[PDB]
């Protein structure tokens, strides 16, 4: 199967015992997607909504901040994307209530003839990618190890929960992580954008995929060698995200001695042995039946974190908060 095939996705959504159209918080309208703009009111079903400003632009969608006094977000996309609403609904259903804070809730979905509007939870302090870019514009240039390791551990923990729900995110990268006000109180880190996600419960047991991402660079290890894959795509995504935090550029992998490893000479990289082991396990998965333990991966990082950064993490996050606030004020 091609898990991103529009026909397959249509067939899957069509044959659900509980289709998206049946949800109490789904709203189907027989009209075009209304014009949405910053600083403008517009009718959304029974409720009138005021659109504040554009928060971010993804590969497909626009995400606006909005209010009815609680503020929320509107993810707008052409054509409609009921699939992301499905996945988001399943994820929050399958997740333990204590895990849901690490992800974005969808309050409702408004589906139109030519597009859709998903209403969901707001995270106020920008993407992880933006945080990385904020460090570029400082003398220290790169995020400090205390934060990088802390975020990395949270990422491993996050996808362990998602995979426990038998879901694949399918697009794990820096701009799909958001920081919220909880960070001011890796607590406020959240993983969003389930548009390309895969629900493995909709396929037979042990199903695998061969389909490849469009770009040669964003392809995981299995894709680059036409090998089959399922959950390994999220492992590669986490590894690539961590690599961006470390080096401020996207990860490109090479093959040496049958082993896959990131390029770059890894100069000026502290905890070298920790990261080599981290990238080794994440990028060298024997097969779909031998996925490395996400818990164990996190424990090894946690060992180094506890050894060096428990007393310093406080100042490190305060430093970042100042940069985030400076960014938000502008
Ligand atoms: N919950 C959120 N709070 C604030 N901004 C968000 C939120 N979700 C997404 N965004 C912003 O919108 C952008 C695109 O949304 P995303 O879900 O990635 O859609 P796409 O599938 O088009 O990438 C993100 O990169 C981010 O900047
Ligand atoms: Cl953790
Ligand atoms: Mg995105
Ligand atoms: Mg997306």
UniProtKB/Swiss-Prot annotation:
Active-site residues per Swiss-Prot or TrEMBL entry: 171 (proton acceptor)
Processing and modification events after translation: Upon spindle-assembly checkpoint activation it is hyperphosphorylated and its kinase activity toward CDC20 is stimulated.
Domain Protein kinase: 49-330
Taxonomic superkingdom: Eukaryota
Cysteine disulfide partners in this protein: none
Tissue specificity statement from the Swiss-Prot or TrEMBL entry: High expression in testis and thymus, less in colon, spleen, lung and small intestine. Expressed in fetal thymus, bone marrow, heart, liver, spleen and thymus. Expression is associated with cells/tissues with a high mitotic index.
Subcellular locations according to the entry: Nucleus; Chromosome, Centromere, Kinetochore
Function description: Serine/threonine-protein kinase that performs 2 crucial functions during mitosis: it is essential for spindle-assembly checkpoint signaling and for correct chromosome alignment. Has a key role in the assembly of checkpoint proteins at the kinetochore, being required for the subsequent localization of CENPF, BUB1B, CENPE and MAD2L1. Required for the kinetochore localization of PLK1. Required for centromeric enrichment of AUKRB in prometaphase. Plays an important role in defining SGO1 localization and thereby affects sister chromatid cohesion. Promotes the centromeric localization of TOP2A.
Family: Belongs to the protein kinase superfamily. Ser/Thr protein kinase family. BUB1 subfamily.
Comment field on protein domains: The KEN box is required for its ubiquitination and degradation. BUB1 N-terminal domain directs kinetochore localization and binding to BUB3.
Disease named in the record: Microcephaly 30, primary, autosomal recessive: A form of microcephaly, a disease defined as a head circumference more than 3 standard deviations below the age, sex and ethnically matched mean. Brain weight is markedly reduced and the cerebral cortex is disproportionately small. MCPH30 is characterized by small head, poor overall growth, and global developmental delay with variably impaired intellectual development. Affected individuals may also have variable congenital anomalies, including atrial septal defect, dysmorphic facial features, tracheal stenosis, and anomalies of the skin and teeth.
Subunit structure: Interacts with BUB3 and KNL1. Interacts (when phosphorylated) with PLK1. The BUB1-BUB3 complex interacts with MAD1L1. (Microbial infection) Interacts with SV40 Large T antigen; this interaction induces activation of a DNA damage response and promotes p53/TP53 stabilization and phosphorylation.
Protein name per the record: Mitotic checkpoint serine/threonine-protein kinase BUB1
Species for this entry: Homo sapiens
Lineage start: Eukaryota, Metazoa, Chordata, Craniata, Vertebrata
